[model samples]
Target chain A: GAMNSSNYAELFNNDIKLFVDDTNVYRVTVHKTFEGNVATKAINGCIFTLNPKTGHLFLKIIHTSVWAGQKRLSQLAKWKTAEEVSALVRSLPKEEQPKQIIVTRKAMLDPLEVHMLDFPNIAIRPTELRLPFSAAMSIDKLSDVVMKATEPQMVLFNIYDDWLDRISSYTAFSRLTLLLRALKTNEESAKMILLSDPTITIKSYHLWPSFTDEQWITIESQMRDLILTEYGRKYNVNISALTQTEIKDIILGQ
Target chain B: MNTVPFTSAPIEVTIGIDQYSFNVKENQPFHGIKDIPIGHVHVIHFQHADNSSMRYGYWFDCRMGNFYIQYDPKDGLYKMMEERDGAKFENIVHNFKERQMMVSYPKIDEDDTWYNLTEFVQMDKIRKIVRKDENQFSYVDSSMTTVQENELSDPAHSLNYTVINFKSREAIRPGHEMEDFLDKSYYLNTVMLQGIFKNSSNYFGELQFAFLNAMFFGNYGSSLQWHAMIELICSSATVPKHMLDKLDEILYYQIKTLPEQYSDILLNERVWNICLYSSFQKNSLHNTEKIMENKYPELL
Candidate 1:
């Protein structure tokens, strides 16, 4: 269920007057050290600051340092958080995690699927070829570090601050993963970044940044193949498309 | 119950199953994480990067220590949907015996999977069959006369698989359409029957809910997985012990029910099939590989 925007008055949103606009968006980098002596490991964070007074959402790294410096998880803790939870969600064995997932709904939808694809001729789409996948962000400097097999596995996250419901960053990666899983390989790695080298990169995401109808079919087919061929009982990876109206992504793994 | 020994090896102990297996009661340990691990249970979220690659990572619900599969969502989620659907279908047949839709028709087996001769039984048909001297299905070609004694002799039409196109929830099929396949391929079509029977958690009625739950998530695989993942995020600030420690069985049932019920079906089938193909002595159906394979094919 969605938090009622109409009830903005009741919800607490601390107004620190930070990360106010697109220009201030970058200011989100200033993370807050956790109150008290907490973990100091600096993970990029922004305050989920909501302003009850102004009805605004602000970004603050209120607990960044605290999160950054947490003591390492004990074997059991790691197992609980990493292994136990992953298995519990994906129903996978503890050592590994679910590969990819594609989500869909029946009737009127929120979080509608993003439409896009990759093909034999166009190895990777333009939007996907870019590191961080930002056509807005030029990437003539990326280098394909290593290509493990025929499959291009070195997919790094181009973290975006956009709302999760959009097919912004994660959507592009999902299509590529489906392709590799179809290629029948145990593991995947990166060779060269299309953004870094013009000569090597051939894919383009011109018409739409979201998955095209055809690509969605290809992704689904690739999953079917893995189940039949790789002795894959279910897919390691799951794929989901953005519905036109879907606002927030719940979480991941399960 | 709230405070955990954060500095120490918080693990009480870790154990492994030969195949991917874990107790359903343990999932509550997951909170505010992309990935969470508890003994043999691990929760993660990932997505496709493109056709050839995927990006994924581990998650820790701050207090739960670490839980969440950090992945390129673009890559991980895309692939998971398809695999989940296939795994779920296998689970349905593997977990429960044929249900009693008024036992409308006896089944026939081909390629090992049984077929239901009727398309859901109607109230009148059920009444006619059980009403001793009433008959309404006669003189009709498509209508039923009775669940024939040897109904298993006839092959039933398999339901067409409807994969709601991720981009367009309007139903679509993946294989080159029906014409593309020489024969209509065997597929598990997801059809939700709302509250058909209540008391799902009750042990006696559980098998029905187990199968229904398995199929529902299996059919709606990608979306539910997303919701479960969202549950991880929505509750991100809370740790397993902080949050789930005080919760009742309902939440626990919902979380564990999704994957555990489905995973077992797939596992049991694989184990049975493997047994039929092997010389190994009959193994307990509980230790099947279908669930194990679906959850972690990489390790299995």
Candidate 2:
């Protein structure tokens, strides 16, 4: 245990933050574990951005780990407020940073979120615009087949990799229609919608099975705020308390 | 639930992913292996003459011995036992067989059900295979499958025990190393379990897989990689037509891409899991202490 009591448990946790600036944009990830920790600072994490066309800067963090017969090395720790981390991100000379920031969030400001928004040159929106799948994929063929048969205002982009644990942290898309969507918005801009239902059914592997109703209210409220901020006038978006039957109808029909 | 001692085999069963292949003998019990005498039936031995396809260390405790399954036609039940115990069939049937499986569909929503498993063994669920083992292990939902094996040089046998590896992405800024290791490990580890535990029990494998992932990664975060794979597998297989089609485009776009790129990432342990586990530090106090070193530098 630490000499003093602090939320080291929360501090050591890994998180993803996206910082966007008009001239240079980058995704800054901090790793404090054995896999990538490399210095006197915290764990070894990395920052990289994808060139939508060249896709060159797409990088993955490689943390440090033990080989079959190696010393059991310890992981380094680096902790900073969102402001401090963002400041470091800002220090990256101009050309190195990215132009637009694509952030994926439901609502509420994390320290990083606030910092990114505070940055003068950065444009932080809840909209995360990236190919749903890889470029090699002929989504042209996929889109055609899917569009004809499916009819949903939104489709979920399962941001998490594990299907099992996602029983909590509910996130869903509010609108999607293959090619039609691709065309609806301008090339440089696209509208994205997300709904967070905090009242998700919980399934436990080790901890609490689900989120509380209060959490749902907060999440729902966050989405409500997002719509007000993002889609207030033009889209005339509104949030209605979906009835159990109405929700079920969508579930069963979709 | 007959609860009577039942035995059946010549029935097929698979053990691990294609990387570690071990199938049951088709239509009959295994009769020969250097370790066991001539009349052994229902035996599963994971050996490849050419190292073409073999799984190592999947069993954590080195449960690497040849296992035998015995059948008593009178009761129509099968029992798995160690060949070291001689040709005698296991007196007590303490085994759980795969029964009617309401395997989960790809989890699009949190409320969605999930399933999918691979290994030296092979089988699918959604149908009922009634069994009456002496242990009274019984169920009747519906899910199940076939098998066979032999010692051959078939590259179809095993993979080289080469430890695959991954290089670290360059850091733009500094962060937590221990947390990174655990977080990333959780990502790759859960994906691996997805393949290993798919369609195992009444979706308990799915539940456990999720929980472990949560423990390593943040209890909540994001992963499009997982959802894509789940959609590809479940929509194309376990999930019903309506449910699968409902996720048509997602399934449609990702299914093709998944096998092409992800098959390697999801199955190839070298990409990370082996190193990932040790990095987890799942049951240790090292994380908090390290944090203290920074928060209250004076303490250290």
Candidate 3:
């Protein structure tokens, strides 16, 4: 009744023996420290037992300490036989067996080699982590649809290319259409118009941002001079006084 | 104007088809002369100090403001004088002995007074004469000397003439014209290249791209080749639009994805900017002098 360490040790030793339920069980008792005291008290013990039916070994623990009507130890009430548990118990401090053993047992018991919970509904196999073959087939079909949709556009591009290639052989409307296409969609064609000689009104498009009005005038004058010189030599006539439309007609052999 | 010493000889230059001589003596004013009609004939007659006589026949058309020397005689000695706008006179003396023509025109001073200034031009240096119109003429001297005569309208005088002469006639050797044209084309190409580089942001644009292709990729690599190609193309009346378009496509793609060799050249902004800023003579004497002065101030 005076809280004797021997009674506690006797209680724990008897409790451990009753919990093992076999006389052939091995027991390792742990001690607790007290200040200004030479003797230590037994607080807990690990008992190793053999299951007679299965002939397998197991470990169990018994604790004498109680707090709030519950055992002080909260982990590893039993486990399969492992040397690390025994080693962990042997490494505990003699002064604080109950507290340190609880901490050590928690550290050793928290980790699991494999997950224990089941997620059967969402679990996916490793091999199934790719796009389906059906999706690939559908992508091919969709690309065909896109190509068909753009079929007329591709043909128009080719036709415009041909017209621009032999622009002189085409009609004035064809030339104007090519120029319009260039102004709207193609920069290269616009540049070809600027560099090449044809009586198209560049001021309508406003494509050249860098050239000044004076520069445009000069380019027009030079183009006119070139055309005049060309036609003058070709027809052996003085075409300098002719209008630009007449010059265009001459160039077209109309 | 500084005055030239007046010749102390009688005016031997005669006008009219019948050779009517002027009555003026040396240093005498020409106030008594009447209106010389158009299509009058004149003869320039003078005697040199060596006792050789110079004579040249000329047709003076007052309406045309021009003098037509009749013949380049074997004697090769000519002397002519003409009145200009009634305010001045011009004297031309051609001496085959010296192979030079001396032309004198009046120069006016700030005070509005005038005196004759003489200039000598070599006879062999006259390359060609270009008739600008019925009244004007230009004399192109092979040594790059050019003389142009322009007509001026004056209410007091029917025919007035102004002569501009650029001197410095060094004999140009044969085949130098070709070399000069080559140099000119090279300079022009360099200027064009500089213009392109200065406007480098517009390289993808049509006009600049066409020029770039012509300069680099149109099988006209050198200045002379490019010059010849341009000359040939301009001489024709046809444009190869189809071939040019194909070439442009090829060149556009080539430049868009430049090859390793072209990238080193075309994409080097430092090199191109230097080319744009510096002259063709990169290590010229003037540049070296500047560098030396900057580096060693005391050496100056």
- Best-matching candidate per TM-score: 2
Ranking by TM-score: 2, 1, 3
lDDT of 2 at A64: 25
lDDT tens digits by residue: candidate 2, B207-246: 2222222222211211222332332233121233332333
Q: With candidate 3 superimposed using the best TM-score fit, by how many Å does residue B253's alpha carbon deviate from the native? A: 53
TM-score for chain A as predicted in candidate 2: 0.24
Cα lDDT listed for each candidate: 0.24, 0.28, 0.27
Q: Write the per-residue lDDT of candidate 3 for residues A119-213, one digit (tens) a residue.
A: 11211111111111111112222223223441111100111122223333223223332333333333343455365654444342222222344
User: Comparing 1 and 3 by TM-score, which wins?
Assistant: 1
Write down the lDDT that model 3 would get. 0.27
**How well is each residue in B55-84 modelled by candidate 3, as lDDT tens digits?**
222222334343332212354333223334
Report the candidate with higher DockQ, 1 versus 3.
1
Q: Write the per-residue lDDT of candidate 2 for residues A1-254, one digit (tens) a residue.
A: 11111321221223322321111111123446678764332222222222222222222221222111333222111112233335545766766554444432222123244445435465433343332222111223223322343221111112222322423221211111221222232212221212124445334231111434465345444433343333324555342544556544432231
Winner on TM-score (2 vs 3):
2
Kindly list the interface RMSD, in angstroms, of each predicted candidate in the order they appear: 12.5, 10.4, 48.5
Per-residue lDDT of A45 in model 1:
20
Among residues 3 or more apart in sequence or in different chains, the pairs in candidate 3 whose N, CA or C atoms overlap within 3 Å are: none
lDDT: worst 10-residue window of model 3 chain A? A111-120
Deviation in Å, model 1, residue A133 alpha carbon? 6.6
Report RMSD for candidate 3: 45.2
